[PDB]
């Protein structure tokens, strides 16, 4: 083992700077522990595999609304990062994608000190996506919950997927499924009323 101790240190260094909870480190340690003992992956890119597990760890509880805010290390061997990511992503699922029916209220999703401004914006984003049927991998309901997250992101609101997965009781992985092929090249989910609070333009990865 060589990249094992190296990756762990790299992850801990980044997680500590971003002020991430143990939910990240503990998870990443458990994930890397298995991905490092892979036949195909003999530790090709330490930085890549480290970031891969890191992304999976903050997937639900840890992501600051966008992965861009923590893309400090995700600027090297990004190809291998996504490569190893898919391997572990299909290894353990929360299995929350079994409801997706009570999001029709939507109001309770903003109970976490979320202004109705995000609510109105989310419905507009969802409408454009649903009416276009950009993501037929689930249902029109899943797009609504996912739109709430997208609306929060574009409103500089750092929310996590945990809220929608557990508190909302919709489906955590459903957000990722909706936020998959919903964008052709850019977040063209804005009708007209969306003035776009965060003018970053290039907003890839949540």
């Amino acid at each position: 083992s060589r990249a094992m101790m190296n990756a762990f240190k790299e992850i801990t260094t980044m997680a500590d700077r971003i002020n991430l909870p143990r939910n990240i480190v503990d998870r990443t340690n458990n994930l890397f522990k298995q991905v490092y003992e892979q036949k195909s992956l003999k530790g090709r890119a330490n930085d890549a595999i480290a970031s891969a597990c890191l992304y999976i760890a903050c997937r639900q509880e840890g992501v600051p609304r966008t992965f861009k805010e923590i893309c400090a290390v995700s600027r090297i061997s990004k190809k291998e990062i996504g490569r190893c990511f898919k391997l572990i992503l299909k290894a353990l699922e929360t299995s929350v994608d079994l409801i997706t029916t009570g999001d029709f209220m939507s109001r309770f999703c903003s109970n976490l000190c979320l202004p109705k401004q995000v609510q109105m914006a989310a419905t507009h984003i969802a409408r454009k996506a649903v009416e276009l049927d950009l993501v037929p991998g689930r249902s029109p309901i899943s797009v609504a919950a996912a739109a709430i997250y997208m609306a929060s992101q574009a409103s500089a609101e750092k929310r996590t997927q945990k809220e929608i997965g557990d508190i909302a009781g919709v489906a955590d992985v459903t957000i990722r499924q909706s936020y998959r092929l919903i964008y052709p090249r850019a977040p063209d989910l804005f009708p007209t009323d969306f003035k776009f609070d965060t003018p970053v333009d290039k907003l890839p990865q949540l």
Binding site: S51, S74, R75, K78, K79, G82, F85, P204
Partner: peptide, 26 residues
């Protein structure tokens, strides 16, 4: 077939920023 799925997220890690700067290459 499941193990065949690896590069599917590669485009969501590398291509995301690579193509994201394509339309903003100025």
């Amino acid at each position: 077939y499941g193990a065949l799925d690896m590069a599917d997220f590669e485009f969501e890690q590398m291509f995301t920023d690579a193509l994201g700067i394509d339309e903003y290459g100025g």
